[PDB]
Design an enzyme around this catalytic site. Structure first.
Site, PDB file in Angstrom:
ATOM      1  N   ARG A 169       1.521 -21.777 -25.162  1.00 28.27           N
ATOM      2  CA  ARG A 169       3.496 -22.512 -25.239  1.00 28.27           C
ATOM      3  C   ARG A 169       4.433 -22.294 -24.278  1.00 28.27           C
ATOM      4  NH1 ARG A 169       2.723 -18.629 -30.061  1.00 28.27           N
ATOM      5  NH2 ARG A 169      -0.021 -19.021 -31.105  1.00 28.27           N
ATOM      6  N   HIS A 198       5.293 -28.348 -26.728  1.00 29.07           N
ATOM      7  CA  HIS A 198       3.935 -28.861 -27.637  1.00 29.07           C
ATOM      8  C   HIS A 198       3.115 -30.037 -27.227  1.00 29.07           C
ATOM      9  CE1 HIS A 198       4.769 -25.316 -29.508  1.00 29.07           C
ATOM     10  NE2 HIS A 198       4.234 -24.935 -30.358  1.00 29.07           N
ATOM     11  N   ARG A 239      -0.739 -28.943 -26.642  1.00 31.58           N
ATOM     12  CA  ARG A 239      -1.246 -28.337 -28.111  1.00 31.58           C
ATOM     13  C   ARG A 239      -2.083 -29.323 -29.208  1.00 31.58           C
ATOM     14  NH1 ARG A 239       0.009 -22.767 -29.093  1.00 31.58           N
ATOM     15  NH2 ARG A 239       1.138 -23.403 -31.622  1.00 31.58           N
ATOM     16  N   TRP A 254      -3.494 -20.718 -33.284  1.00 27.32           N
ATOM     17  CA  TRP A 254      -3.177 -21.386 -34.798  1.00 27.32           C
ATOM     18  C   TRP A 254      -3.838 -19.981 -36.218  1.00 27.32           C
ATOM     19  CZ3 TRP A 254      -4.635 -25.792 -32.060  1.00 27.32           C
ATOM     20  CH2 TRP A 254      -3.227 -26.601 -31.465  1.00 27.32           C
ATOM     21  N   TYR A 296      -1.634 -32.203 -36.909  1.00 31.25           N
ATOM     22  CA  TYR A 296      -2.256 -33.342 -35.761  1.00 31.25           C
ATOM     23  C   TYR A 296      -3.005 -33.872 -35.538  1.00 31.25           C
ATOM     24  CZ  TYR A 296       1.365 -29.883 -34.047  1.00 31.25           C
ATOM     25  OH  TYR A 296       2.252 -28.300 -33.314  1.00 31.25           O
TER      26      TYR A 296
END
Ligand code: MG
Ligand code: MG
Ligand code: MG
Ligand code: MG
Ligand code: MG
Ligand code: MG
Ligand code: MG
Ligand code: MG
Ligand code: MG
Ligand code: MG
Lengths: 322, 332, 322, 321
Positions: D153, D269, D272, D295, D304
């Site tokens: 991140r 993000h 990711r 995660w 996602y």
DNA sequence: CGATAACTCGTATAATGTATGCTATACGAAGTTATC
DNA sequence: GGATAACTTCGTATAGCATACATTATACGAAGTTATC
DNA sequence: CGATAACTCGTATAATGTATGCTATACGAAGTTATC
DNA sequence: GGATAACTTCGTATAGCATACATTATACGAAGTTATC
């Protein structure tokens, strides 16, 4: 009281926090109760134990179902608890009578019913029976059924689909985003995918109907006697109508519903869910995959919807004979 | 009914509430009433013997009684029943429930831990699997005794349909019908649940069908479509159809016990439970056969009317197909 | 209050309703909390919220771990709640300072540690390396390492297996019945199966130790310097002993450990639990199976025990390096 | 009265909350007090009836159920930490919140997520900057390489320093991430760059010369001339890193739309999401995908990859056979 | 136009998840009854 | 008048199944409503 | 009898789910500060 | 001097991560114990 009247209006104030059907029913029951209370001279509110007891016994006497009887009692409960008073079920006489009626009726032979199955077998037949019909309305109905069986969504859910809630997979399959179902009300919702076949049946309807000219238009709309879709973004097709497609499609293959007054004599709103569940069970689909399918999180119901192969059945018969 | 609501003790809305409960006694199964009454008896007897007031129950006495049941060697599930019935008797008479008292809760938890830590474990019926039905069949199919013909049909039906004994005892001739294949279809009406997952109808295999057909031929139960499929057969080998009296589940349980005795001999000496087949042995065995055969869980649960995967997993836990991810990983 | 002392007396009378360890720690924390309170003229019970705050800071100052401080506060919480009094954590003072201590220490660089993995890689080495020994000690220890890695059972659990708790699958693999675990205390228990290979290691130990003489004998026991096993049905091998078995096996392949004084410089009780977790992870086992394996229900600790590859590593690297 | 005392203790142990938490607290509190002194309502203690009106106001202003939840939330935290009863405990408020959510979800309000920055994108972006000596580009091409390769991140990216980089036997770079704001950082302590990304990160380490000092944050500022301005007292801001995403997206698709829609161009993000999505098409187990990016909430990763064909479900399979 | 295809209401009743409270089975033994 | 096969009843011990709870949907005949025919 | 292999105890710290409360990102835009 | 590149610093609108809670277990160096050698 005063705090009671307050809590009541506060419930009525934000009555949107609850379902439309919930209120439709609170009321329906309240009249029924009020009527009876009056014709029998009982203070309908707060409801007193013995009165709700005679009342449930009365409904039982009228030959109503157990589910139906639990509904009135249930609603009476909501009204009192929500208002701050104790529940008529918080009393031995009511809670015990309710148990008694269930047992008594079950024993006398009563039993909950369930939509007649609309299984894969049926879909194919219906499809190879409307697959061509250029009739703009046949195009629609064949897409509804296809989506209903493919996704197991409930009618009220299919009815709320807008064209903008559709997307696709790199594979060319449609993704219908569902925001609100009977068990979930979230801004995250869920995505139901259609197969290459049904996604096709839906594409043809999207063109022919011209619902796609405005992304905010509901996917399914009504078709008038001339064969012309009436796309809209304010009015969605009614569930009563979606039930009609099932009745009509059923009649188109078995004809007039044997006037017997009984329910589920022909397909209806849920016919696709039970059918689909039954088709997965036979296919050997796992419990978690069958849940994802109908938005369930408990094996039950899927179990209720089953009483599979009748005739030469299977499983133990297949095991025993070999 | 109940021990004796003390003229003094019992009083006010309790005599009231207690009455309401008998007014709607139909709100509970008769078996439920049997256990409620048994527990009260049991508790009232302990009370007299130990000079305690049996109603309402003081938490400190219910605790003594609970430790008393533990010392008697009873199971945690049994002890739980006694507390449960005492809680019902109380809640339904308008009074607080034991186990709602700090002491009773803590002792129940202690008793449960101590007991589990002593090795106590739940049991389940000895399975009567496919390979038992075949051996038992290869022996009884040659008998003409009306009893053996009846008992072998019961076993076939019990194993084939996975029905509970209470349910088999209720089957009446008219609930049977034939299928295109020429095999029987048994219809089970009146359950206890509105959502009877069991299955309104159960199909018998061709082999089992022949077995049931032979029992019908020799017992003459077909003389009236209202006769129950299974009835008695006396000393003289003569069946006795009836439409008012069904065989007692006890007797069916006896058929499993007896058929197991025929093959393996008299029962062990200990007073152990499940040393021979009982009325659940077929359900357990069938679940295991279907599992070994690769049938899916939903399909297994549907076959026997199950609704709690936890139970079917209990019945097939020792199968190799259920050994796990590490075994796979180790043995590759 | 009569109620407070009666609640406390109830608990102490049925102390056995809790873990012996829960009692062990309650007493430890209390004395520690009693000492400080005396050395500072503070009422130790019922504890004052401002004092618990001070005490929790005193512990932070002592340089103790976040969890260690949480345990102290935790017991003081239990003592009170179970008394019928409010908990120190029910006060902003204690509530916030506990979040702060964690927050601070976390930034200061304090991290929760975890056992050094004992993965398939090591089991395979430790085995081929001891697999031929005929020494009771060696034979026992290999079987223990085997069960520890294969079942993921915690040492406390393994130390309780009695020979009667062992059965076999129709295929021949051993099945150990477990009644109690850190998170389950039922009469149903669960069954932990062994691989054809590990069941071998345990069979060799059973025959060589003579624990099978009494089905009530614990599967593992002591093995004196004379190489003879001393089965028992009253005393089980210490969990400390089991820990030692891990330490010992790790010295046999890496000599004495660092002078760091740090924990986890060698294999310990949980070493096989995190190791097997990791192996399953790298093998692609599903979330429900990895959980069924270690008795978990959530994914957190599994994800915790993970860090897998670091050299060439996999995951994204393998993916990227096409 | 004693709330002052309560409030004092909260300010006493203000370290009990993150900087971002106090930010929203203060921010939401300002919005609350504003609305009040403009409607004549004591802003504190807040009466349930007032809060209700207020919440209905946020709905009329057009905010999201999630944003409305944040206001109600911070409002609650204030009271709870002041010894007073939280407004969510009142029937009025809990009733409106139920109404608002149902009304909004029904109005079509949907939760959104970053725009996927998948492999294909990382390739395109590279083959179009791969060959460039623009000091800036080199930096931005590496930040992308890392972001995608490590699933890290941005706040984390911004905190990496040369001190934290090492070498694998295979010669690949291994970023060690410490002090991650979590006692149980079930995400990882080390991340390994691929041979490809290692090259890119190296090329930036020389041209930027951030390697002059170890405490030097791997990534730094770069003036309007082409000169990297290393430092170890200040790190590239998260906003900036976000921009790098926006910028690289504009470079390929132009500018965004008038519609103030969110997630029109890559963002924090975006890596990711796409990272997750690619591993999924590869067939990487959920746990292996979860650990790869730190995660611990399977629903998120499932969000996602929901639109992937490999997640279409049993009925699709059954209908196609 | 008037007749029609094709679509709001109100009462009745299904659905939705699951700890645990009610409900079956277990089974030794006493009680029965028609047969040896 | 016995003794006995084969139950049935009984009472207590234990395993196992299903529902109370609080809403939220569907079912469907009968009215009512429009644009077409 | 010693010496020794192989085994209580007390403080310290990890492990058990997960709903939702705290945390982090999104992003337009307004200040900055060295280059152009 | 004036106009930027490329950022910071900001406030607020939203997405997403991980912790409180109440026990229950393991870590591990020491001191204590007991058959054996
Ligand atoms: Mg009974
Ligand atoms: Mg066998
Ligand atoms: Mg018999
Ligand atoms: Mg026999
Ligand atoms: Mg046997
Ligand atoms: Mg705590
Ligand atoms: Mg208490
Ligand atoms: Mg519910
Ligand atoms: Mg006899
Ligand atoms: Mg917990």
């Amino acid at each position: 009281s005063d705090e009671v009247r307050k809590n009541l209006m506060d419930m009525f104030r934000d009555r949107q926090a609850f379902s439309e059907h919930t209120w439709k029913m609170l009321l329906s029951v309240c009249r029924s109760w009020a009527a009876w209370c009056k014709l029998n001279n009982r203070k309908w509110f707060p409801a007193e134990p013995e009165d709700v007891r005679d009342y449930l016994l009365y409904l039982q006497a009228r030959g109503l179902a157990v589910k139906t009887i639990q509904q009135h009692l249930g609603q009476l409960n909501m009204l009192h608890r929500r208002s701050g008073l104790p529940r008529p079920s918080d009393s031995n006489a009511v809670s015990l009578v309710m148990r008694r009626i269930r047992k008594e009726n079950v024993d006398a032979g009563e039993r909950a019913k369930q939509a007649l199955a609309f299984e894969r077998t049926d879909f194919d037949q219906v499809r190879s029976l409307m697959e061509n019909s250029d009739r703009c309305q046949d195009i629609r109905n064949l897409a509804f059924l296809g989506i209903a069986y493919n996704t197991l969504l409930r009618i009220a859910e299919i009815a709320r689909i807008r064209v903008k809630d559709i997307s696709r997979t790199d594979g060319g399959r449609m993704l219908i985003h569902i925001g609100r179902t009977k068990t979930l009300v979230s801004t995250a919702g869920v995505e139901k995918a259609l197969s290459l076949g049904v996604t096709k049946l839906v594409e043809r309807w999207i063109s022919v109907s011209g619902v796609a000219d405005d992304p905010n238009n509901y996917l399914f709309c009504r078709v008038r006697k001339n064969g012309v879709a009436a796309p809209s973004a304010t009015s969605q097709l009614s569930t009563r109508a979606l039930e009609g497609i099932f009745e009509a499609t059923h009649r188109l293959i078995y004809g007039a519903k044997d006037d017997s007054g009984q329910r589920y004599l022909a397909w209806s709103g849920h016919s696709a869910r039970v059918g689909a569940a039954r088709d997965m069970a036979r296919a050997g689909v796992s419990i978690p995959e069958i849940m994802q399918a109908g938005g369930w999180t408990n094996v039950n119901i899927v179990m209720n919807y089953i009483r599979n192969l009748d005739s030469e059945t299977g499983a133990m018969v297949r095991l025993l004979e070999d």
